[PDB]
Amino acid sequence: KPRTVICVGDIHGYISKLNNLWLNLQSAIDPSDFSSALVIFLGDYCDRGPETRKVIDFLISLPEKHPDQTHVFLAGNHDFAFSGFLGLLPRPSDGSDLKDTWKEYSKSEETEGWYTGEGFEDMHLQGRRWAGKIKAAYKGSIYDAGSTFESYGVPHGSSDLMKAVPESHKKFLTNMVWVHEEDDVCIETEEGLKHCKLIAVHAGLEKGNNVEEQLKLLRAKDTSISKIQHLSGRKNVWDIPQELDDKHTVVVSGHHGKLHIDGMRLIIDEGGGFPDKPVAAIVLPSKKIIRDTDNLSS
Template identity: 55%
Template sequence: MSEPQKPRVVICVGDIHGFVTRLRNLWSNLEGSIDLSEFETATVIFLGDYCDRGPDTRHVIDFLVSLPSRYPRQKHVFLCGNHDLAFAAFLRLLPPPQNGSPFSEGWKEYEASEDREGWFNGEGYENMYLQGRRWSGTIKVKFNTAKGTDYQGSIYDARPTFESYGLPHASPGFSLFFSLPISFFFLVFGYCKSVFESWGSSLRADLVKAVPDEHKKFLADLVWVHEEISKLCGSPLVQQSLFRLLTDDDVFMNTDDGVKCCKLIAVHAGLEKGADVKEQLKLLKARDTRVPKVEALSGRKSVWDIPEELTASPTIVVSGHHAKLHVEGLRLIIDEGGGYKDRPVAAIVLPSMKIIRDTDVLAK
């Protein structure tokens, strides 16, 4: 009788947020913690948010785009995070709304926040996806009370991303523009307006030039959702002869009740508990930009739990985004770092359910 196959290794990597040294250290620890043959054939799912907050988005993307040639037997999945979506939007890499409407239709619902968030208003803003304007803007509030840290340029903390490509996010004069007394603003409105428009025009054009074509393609190709759907999960044959009939689509995880064969859905923030799952997946697979704020990429409480309709058959829902490490049943949230300077970048390895961090010190 032939030996039963081992279930394939699936690695889910949490938010990186521009910390390339942490990414390299994490990758090294993954390679050192997993059997070499299993690592070389693993499915590696990156859960999104490669840019912003940390200092080296450029080299993070360099590392990621190099993986398919360096590890040709691995399967690599690059999910789109809300920060990546906004970065891509500013570079105009997103598909247009499917109904032919302009991106500006999506601004209306959120216009009350435009002044406080300092939305981008320079060259090309007229037909820009909402999150691109928010990402590249200059927020007036300096301190983020929710995170307990200063904002880094915009509400998305995008300044380090600009700097990683050798550009300032905003000139000193533009920062001063927002701190001037209102009376002075009216006196010199014409001058300030011309400075602002000149700065805005060069801001986007300069970043478009600075971002390599390979990086643009990476951002344009990011998927909003990824599914691993086994044809065998739930089959009595699998339960009776575990691992003997495995296919490339099977995902397993260790549980208190033994090894479980599961479907897997990976999406940056999660799926809305109160919305139809099929409709959500349809929108995500189509990358439907009619929606100015995609809850599955940017939601919080609404996407924390697994939708009830997915409980009919074992379905892992794995995400990053939430600045937490949360493993409860089949709901996996792998974002221990959250872009904070003092937290590690983590990954989870299936089926073992082992958490690997960039800070781990492996035994020699």
């Protein structure tokens, strides 16, 4: 029997959505299949929604609750920016300063009100934007980070978040991957069951540029890039690119604020961080969509 693969879209601090989705998944999938499933969270665990702390607590609990599952946590653009603020991102491998990432978007500083508190000088651009005070709806910053700060019991933009975030949560953020590659997954197609490679990345991959070169920077967590299109892109990362569009590679993302299935391209973000939208997961091989708003039984 083929291994069950669960890909879960953007959570954005909605603990009730996460919990209810996890509960529904256990009625959609028989216990034997669920117990040994590969579970890929597609990123964006923080911001917009009210309970980031509880979300990360829940995600930390999963290896203990389900010891035979494999858990993969993608970094979303929101989580990258959160990690940046906490100073958890490695210094750029090319020897450049984290402050060098600011220049490209320097004109945006005033309107976005970039963070200038403790440790800002050695902070990635996205960290400063994330903890910024956007000029006046946005929750504190352009990233809606206000709700993340508040879930850890501190005011928006406060350097005290660095003390308030538990060591286990910092460890969780450090353990996030920018890309996940799986050699062999099963997926139902119109022609039947196929074995495919899987690439999971928060937003997607870029056209034109060499795919392996892109994967290299994601594997290595290249922090010299001001805005990582693989985490933050839109139209430029929507399609499966040139080298991978040969029906042997599943490319799964969240990020886009849409649930969109087009053959091997799986975009799983029905929620978009909206309080009134469901969080969806896709279950492979069947490609069935499970939502927190489902009322499933076995």
